[PDB]
Amino acid sequence: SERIPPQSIEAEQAVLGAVFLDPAALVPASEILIPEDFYRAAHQKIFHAMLRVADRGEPVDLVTVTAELAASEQLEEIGGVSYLSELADAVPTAANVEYYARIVEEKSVLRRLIRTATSIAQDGYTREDEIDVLLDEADRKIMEVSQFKNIKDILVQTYITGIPTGFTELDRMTSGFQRSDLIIVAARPSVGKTAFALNIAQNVATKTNENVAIFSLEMSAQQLVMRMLCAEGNINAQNLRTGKLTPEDWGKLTMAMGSLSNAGIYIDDTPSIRVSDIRAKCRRLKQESGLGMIVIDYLQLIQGSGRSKENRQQEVSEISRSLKALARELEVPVIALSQLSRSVEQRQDKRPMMSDIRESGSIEQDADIVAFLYRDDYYNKDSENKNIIEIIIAKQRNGPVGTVQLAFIKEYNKFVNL
Amino acid sequence: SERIPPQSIEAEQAVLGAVFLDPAALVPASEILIPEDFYRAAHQKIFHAMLRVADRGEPVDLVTVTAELAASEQLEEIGGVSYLSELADAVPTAANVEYYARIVEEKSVLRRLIRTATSIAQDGYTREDEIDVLLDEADRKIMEVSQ
Amino acid sequence: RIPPQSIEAEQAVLGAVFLDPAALVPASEILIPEDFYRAAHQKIFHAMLRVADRGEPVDLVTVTAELAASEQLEEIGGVSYLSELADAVPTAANVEYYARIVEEKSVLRRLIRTATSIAQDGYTREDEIDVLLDEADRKIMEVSQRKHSGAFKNIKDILVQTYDNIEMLHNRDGEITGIPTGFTELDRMTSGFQRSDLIIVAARPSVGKTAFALNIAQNVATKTNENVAIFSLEMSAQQLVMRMLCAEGNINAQNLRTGKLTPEDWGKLTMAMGSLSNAGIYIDDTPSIRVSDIRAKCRRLKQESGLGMIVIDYLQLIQGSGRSKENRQQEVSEISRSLKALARELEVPVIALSQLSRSVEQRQDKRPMMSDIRESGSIEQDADIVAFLYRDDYYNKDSENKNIIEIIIAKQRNGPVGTVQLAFIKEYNKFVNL
Amino acid sequence: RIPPQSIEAEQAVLGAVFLDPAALVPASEILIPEDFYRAAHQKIFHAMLRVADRGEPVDLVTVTAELAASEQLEEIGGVSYLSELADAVPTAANVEYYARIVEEKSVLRRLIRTATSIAQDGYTREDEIDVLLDEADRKIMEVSQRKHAFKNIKDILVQTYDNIEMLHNRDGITGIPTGFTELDRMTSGFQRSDLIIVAARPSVGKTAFALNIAQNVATKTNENVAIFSLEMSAQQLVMRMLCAEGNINAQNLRTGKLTPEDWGKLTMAMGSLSNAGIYIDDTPSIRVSDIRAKCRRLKQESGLGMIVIDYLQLIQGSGRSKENRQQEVSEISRSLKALARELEVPVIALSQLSRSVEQRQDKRPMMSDIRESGSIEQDADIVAFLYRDDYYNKDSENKNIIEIIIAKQRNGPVGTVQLAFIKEYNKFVNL
Amino acid sequence: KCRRLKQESGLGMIVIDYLQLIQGSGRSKENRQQEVSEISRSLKALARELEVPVIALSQLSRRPMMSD
DNA sequence: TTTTTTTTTTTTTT
Ligand SMILES: Nc1nc2c(ncn2[C@@H]2O[C@H](COP(=O)(O)OP(=O)(O)O)[C@@H](O)[C@H]2O)c(=O)[nH]1
Ligand SMILES: Nc1nc2c(ncn2[C@@H]2O[C@H](COP(=O)(O)OP(=O)(O)O)[C@@H](O)[C@H]2O)c(=O)[nH]1
Ligand SMILES: Nc1nc2c(ncn2[C@@H]2O[C@H](COP(=O)(O)OP(=O)(O)O)[C@@H](O)[C@H]2O)c(=O)[nH]1
Ligand code: ALF
Ligand code: ALF
Ligand code: ALF
Ligand SMILES: [Ca+2]
Ligand SMILES: [Ca+2]
Ligand SMILES: [Ca+2]
Ligand SMILES: [Ca+2]
Ligand SMILES: [Ca+2]
Ligand SMILES: [Ca+2]
Ligand SMILES: [Ca+2]
User: Fold this and answer.
1) d(CA B29, nearest CA chain A) in Å
2) Quick check: D277 and D241 in contact, CB under 8 A?
3) Is D254 helix (H, G, I), strand (E, B) or coil?
4) Which of B1, C40, C397, E43 is most open to solvent, judged by the fewest CB atoms within 10 Å of its CB?
5) Domain B1-147 bears CATH identifier 1.10.860.10
6) Where is this region: C-terminal domain (CTD) (chain C)?
7) What is the spatial distance between Cα A393 and Cα A170, in angstroms, rounded to a whole number?
8) Catalytic residue list contains D331
9) Which of C95, C123, C151 marks a domain boundary?
């Protein structure tokens, strides 16, 4: 019934706030937004002023901005200096404006869509005159809700936002591991899925100060920790397995244990959980300690909410939705490991494409970002350049698509930079 | 705007009428239209029956059509034989069915457009979850409407 | 509830008899009086046959005379009911079909009636099981055992149609029986381009497929009086007409698309346009059609103007009927069938251009064989006639005797197989006799 | 309106089991629990079998133990009802008879039920008449252990001897004779119930050969032959036969450009072909069921001898959805053999061949080459390939010669036979 | 992308760095010959729709002839 | 909707 034009004027305030706090934060903000993207009339005017002052450039602080707003009839229209003062105290830091700007922008696009859709329907009843050209306008008007490098742009001239993974090249392409993202890491069996996830978890939990929850549905907590120890200290896994450790290995282990203690990584190895359970547990850990990342050791191993044992494709379709929504609710990146269907092993080229994600196509469709792992040496016994592993970033609606290379020293359960 | 979906019932009846009059006029008619293009539930069923009988082919006259409509539960649903009789008389001759068919068709497309645009707007307020795939659906749903 | 019946249809039959009345012959071949549901129609249709046995013959008078001759005229409604029957049948030339409805409904209730009496007997004769099951078996066949109607063409009847058809032929001047292409040597070998034939013209890319098809279309449309439909899925209508103009007037194609025309070229163009106007060639350049669409369009053009030929610019470009994106070989297998079936239904030659696989270029002898037809072998099979185009000069840059082009007639179930030779002056988009 | 049943006999069966209980063996060979009419007996006889599968075995104790093990002991009357069942029959010595009563009653109400549902469907599905009949036919046969007793060899040997006897008292081709001597020697007909596959590349001579056979059968013998042409019209077929019957050049015939002696030839070609009795159905799409129906009827009133089908892969499938096409034709293949078997008449199915063969050195076909499904090789009683050297060689020495390669037959001998195929006359001739 | 560039600036030519590098529409990674058979048609169709020459670069198997 | 195993017609893989 009551239809409220979509907006988040909390997030709006968070953007303007960050600018008064930083103000190098105006660069990302304006790359992402124009003044009109803001819903509240007042913010429109403020963010306009902010850019107006940057074009001088003054630069942009609480003073100069009010100076610019008074320079036009506008300072009284937007609330007082007292409103501009509130905007400042909105956020603790001008950390991650990029995040909130992208919310404001996404909402803007939504109502632009709604508006052009309603005006198409509107015109459906009126211009009953020229059917084929009405269909062209509809085509064209729906594309224009979306907003090719020129030769000149390409002449800038010859000759992390972001929870950081610790893999430079991936981080450059991605910049974290962003709050609220669903990150899918899929690859054939025994290729390196878990290894890669665990490596990321360590570098986050040890290098940063954030807590990470890992749900392992296949491996025990014990086996997980043993993988991390080997990777932290470069101890050969076979040796560690057996207890057959060299005198310096003991040193390496003593160390590895040290650093992993203050690491703060919470592991849940219950073999059958529903997403609701996962949510519950994380909600509580965030409550009392704060959460940074959630890792899930594997999406199709999670189990369904009651809908009866439904068309299994729908069952996972649903798990997929739930996870994204959990990532959204807790404002935290969620890395979900996925399997792939065997169809890749038919191809003469064994690099996965999005279609290959096992069991339900909705996973491609819910993910904020899809990463495949490919290893030449998985297939070739003799393969030249062994330890190399491609991290194919097949999808991301932050930005760039592409492949990144790392080394996967298997004896050490370890991924390394090159 | 109205809330009056685009249609042209002068024209639907004119098509069905021409078929009972000719009935070689069913050939142009069906090239141009499928039963669903008709707005009135009743005409849908009738034009379907007409094609159903042509596939035998009987062929298509006021008798065989009512025989086919009664063969399903439908003869009473579409008005009587008395409505089929009216359809016959809602026409001089069946020259240029192609013309009126293309009107019926064009109106069909209009409401199909209106219907998909409203459902896009509808979905705009609900599925605030995805943005990029919501824009994909809109892209894709509007192409599917040029057929 | 209500037993299956059609009075709309019963009346239509009786009506047609009072209208024709030669319509009583099909009617009675298909029906006996008992097949009618309404007690009254039973009696009327009986009277009709009763009067036919004299024979009177059957009209509104004699019938009422016969019905009054028994106690029956008042029982069936009045003369006023017989009068209504007259007025209540749309077109009397298809009594066959209304009769078949009345007949089909008759069979239905006969089935219902024997099925209910089986169930009936199930409770009663609980005595001898095996002979009860045999009777059920046997009683249900005796429904299927429906009399007259049952398509097997008796040979006595066909032979007559053949003699009479031969006869007709024998009084035509003669030579070509079909639609003449205007290429003498090909026409001698083929004699048209026969109604209902599927003609496949296949050859490697840029060899001359379309060129050859268009040339045939012109010579048919301008030399004869027949209409020809051309479906072009690759080229536009305007490119097609531009090819015909060049060929009709011997205007150099490069000159023509530049507008760089000599003073006599204009003359040639003025003529070309003149004759191509009264030509009557209907062009459909929609780049994706289903065969169903083609059928539909042709059916209508034949309706109001009459059709002679259908040309299709190429078969593997046509698109499938829904069966999902099936084993592609099957998809075209089906298109193939549909085309032959279309030529059959419209009683008109259908010339389908086809591509060839890379097979032939691998061979030493680059001349195509049937196997080479691209994408599905069913095309060789379905075709009435398969023509390949081979140009030596297509492969040899230097080739001795250039403009010559073989028309290899690799298949025909009319008659003779063989090769024919023509010249293909490419500068003029033109095929010529030798 | 009271369902056929025989409770007395039901009790007698259950009784005998509690009495014997080796009587359960015959009982279960004859009955399943559902055959019993009384809800209670159903459950009891189920329990009996359930306990036998352990096996306990089956007595008044173990049975009540099993019935109490489910919620059922109170539902079937008490232990007191099971006790009555024991006392109901004298001895166990003839469960077989009571079982057969229960069974016969079961069949009765199964019949009544399918009959009522046929009448039921009569008012509803007024849509398709011919496929509604077939279902009735088929639904009423399914009312038996109709798929089910062994045939003893002593008995077969006799009917075999007696057959050999009669064969001898003939008249030795066994056999509908094709009129091609060398083929007939190898084959002896064209036997009742055989499926004969004639396959060859396009425009090689498939139809021509089949038609020639049909004539010589229909005119030389007195038997009726049905031809289903799915590709050519009835007219085109008759025109081929006229040319072959009278040696009239086909080109002349289809122009009307006939010599004075040609009309003579035509006049008596027509003459002999009239009393020929060949029934032609040229409907371009039929299912095998349709073919079956039409033949069944023609045999009914005139008797049938041969069925010719202008061509197996052109036939269309029974509903199973547009299935793996190989299975679709796999099925048509089965149906055809089963039709030949049911009508006790040779069925000649023409077949196409895959392009496989065009790839070879030796262009003589092998069984594998049959187009679209390998089940055809397997189902066929006999597989005949046509090969023509002159089909591939433009210049070929000895033109009109054509091999009839008999690649398969489970009557007997395999081998090649030679004929001449005078194409100008649509005619195959002996050598 | 081209539809949009033509929309606001007008297009004249499209050049593509190479045809067999383009990737398939979902049909499962089909008989690869069909996959590019498809790309081929799509391209022609695109050239036709935008009324603009499309230059597609192509590789050759194994003076070339068309078969290659 | 998807994942699996089978048979059998096509094209194109240096
Ligand atoms: N050489 C060596 N390789 C190992 C050792 N331990 C594990 N690996 C390899 O490292 C990989 C880790 O398993 P993983 O890929 O995470 O399982 P996933 O979830 O299917 O991807 C496997 O491919 C193992 O073969 C070891 O002790 N020595
Ligand atoms: N000299 C000359 N030759 C041409 C001209 N236009 C076309 N041709 C040749 O004429 C033929 C016509 O195309 P076509 O063979 O019908 O295409 P197809 O459908 O693949 O058979 C081509 O093979 C051309 O290379 C022209 O303007 N001048
Ligand atoms: N010379 C000549 N050959 C003919 C004539 N009529 C038919 N043929 C040939 O006879 C053969 C008929 O083969 P057919 O059985 O219809 O092909 P199939 O059904 O696929 O085996 C073809 O090879 C034709 O070329 C004719 O009048 N003259
Ligand atoms: F081998 Al895994 F997930 F444990 F693919
Ligand atoms: F030009 Al083409 F087949 F090569 F039509
Ligand atoms: F071409 Al055919 F049977 F006449 F395959
Ligand atoms: Ca794992
Ligand atoms: Ca979803
Ligand atoms: Ca998939
Ligand atoms: Ca997002
Ligand atoms: Ca062409
Ligand atoms: Ca044939
Ligand atoms: Ca006779």
Assistant:
1) 19
2) no
3) coil
4) C397
5) yes
6) 176-434
7) 9
8) no
9) C123
